[PDB]
Design a protein around this ligand. Structure first.
Ligand SMILES: CN1CCCN(c2ncnc3ccccc23)CC1
Ligand SMILES: CN1CCCN(c2ncnc3ccccc23)CC1
Ligand SMILES: [Cu+2]
Ligand SMILES: [Cu+2]
Ligand SMILES: [Zn+2]
Ligand SMILES: [Zn+2]
Lengths: 153, 153
């Protein structure tokens, strides 16, 4: 298998740890971990293009989009490679994450390693919000925490 | 050109920013930036194998060594791919870095993107210290600051 990992930090209380594992080349990637310090509800969760956090999470640029598509949800055909939807926090501010995604990869042109995982301020509307920004960012707002996705042992 | 970047942080006062640029595929890589908060003297400077900072800089593992060689300096034929020698701080605590290396790459099997850059506690002896550890780590001590090397715009 191929493995990757991301430590999420920002300027506020949000922080987390997310693991990625891919059994086979071109097969699905399991994504799991925990994020804390959140407000209750949905927070957009995306791989952004650049693994640059020079100036904070803003430096990571737009959602990772090697296939030239519009923004969507992870269950949509029309989506960015980096569109992993939302994580959902309870009242305690914790999101336990355990999903599988077929579009991200840990090798090749869909590879997310060396890019930035970001957890956002607000819900991602998954492109269904009825404005142009919806089909670009999902209207998920600012970047609460992020980290560069790295190769794991 | 291909570009990458790394934000160095840790538990202490050391922090920095390092840029990488590779003009031609498989060509030399320019490495430049600044590290502050260092004690006066040499600090070992390496790409480590993993981009895992789960538990801090320790999680990055040994030096990036795809060819299973012994530790050396950047000028040596016998070196780890990640062996970038030392950065050198004055009394101001600053090392202003400007290196070119032809062994590291931002593509291929020697790609450093997705791995961890680390600045160490003390001098790297470039494998000339006369003990087994010299030939593994350069006796450069603990990990003051690190970050995952990411794809840049
Ligand atoms: C509760 N935990 C302990 C075992 C580590 N965990 C996993 N390990 C390996 N692969 C996974 C794939 C999908 C979801 C979780 C895991 C689960 C976290
Ligand atoms: C457009 N680019 C990134 C920053 C500017 N560039 C540099 N390249 C290489 N070394 C440097 C050392 C100090 C300051 C700037 C650079 C040229 C490539
Ligand atoms: Cu996003
Ligand atoms: Cu090192
Ligand atoms: Zn998107
Ligand atoms: Zn080494």
């Amino acid at each position: 298998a191929t493995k990757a990992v991301c430590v999420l930090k920002g300027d506020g209380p949000v922080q987390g740890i997310i693991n990625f594992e891919q059994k086979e080349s071109n097969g699905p990637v399991k994504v799991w971990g925990s994020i804390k310090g959140l407000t209750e509800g949905l927070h957009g969760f995306h791989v952004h293009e650049f693994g640059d956090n020079t100036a904070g999470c803003t430096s990571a640029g737009p959602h990772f989009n090697p296939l030239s598509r519009k923004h969507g949800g992870p269950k949509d055909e029309e989506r960015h490679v980096g569109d992993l939807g939302n994580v959902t926090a309870d009242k305690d501010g914790v999101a336990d994450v355990s999903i599988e995604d077929s579009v991200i990869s840990l090798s090749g042109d869909h590879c997310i390693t060396g890019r930035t995982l970001v957890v956002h301020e607000k819900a991602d509307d998954l492109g269904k919000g009825g404005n142009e920004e919806s089909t670009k960012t999902g209207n998920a707002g600012s970047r609460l925490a992020c980290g560069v996705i790295g190769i794991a042992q």
